[PDB]
Design a protein around this nucleic acid. Sequence first.
DNA 1: ACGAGC
DNA 2: AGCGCGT
Lengths: 8, 10
Amino acid sequence: XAXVXAXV
Amino acid sequence: TXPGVTXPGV
DNA sequence: ACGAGC
DNA sequence: AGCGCGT
Ligand SMILES: *C(=O)c1cnc2ccccc2n1
Ligand SMILES: *C(=O)c1cnc2ccccc2n1
Ligand SMILES: [Cl-]
Ligand SMILES: [Mg+2]
């Protein structure tokens, strides 16, 4: 859930 | 949600 | 370097 | 109760 690189 | 931003639900 | 969403 | 990742 975090979008630091995927934001899923 | 999603699993995925499961379902809603399951 | 990071946890979101009925 | 129920789970996914890439720059
Ligand atoms: C969002 O909180 C989140 C948490 N853990 C994960 C593990 C693997 C892929 C995606 C994920 N997303
Ligand atoms: C994005 O592609 C990505 C990949 N690896 C990570 C590791 C730790 C924190 C954030 C990250 N983001
Ligand atoms: Cl599933
Ligand atoms: Mg499953």
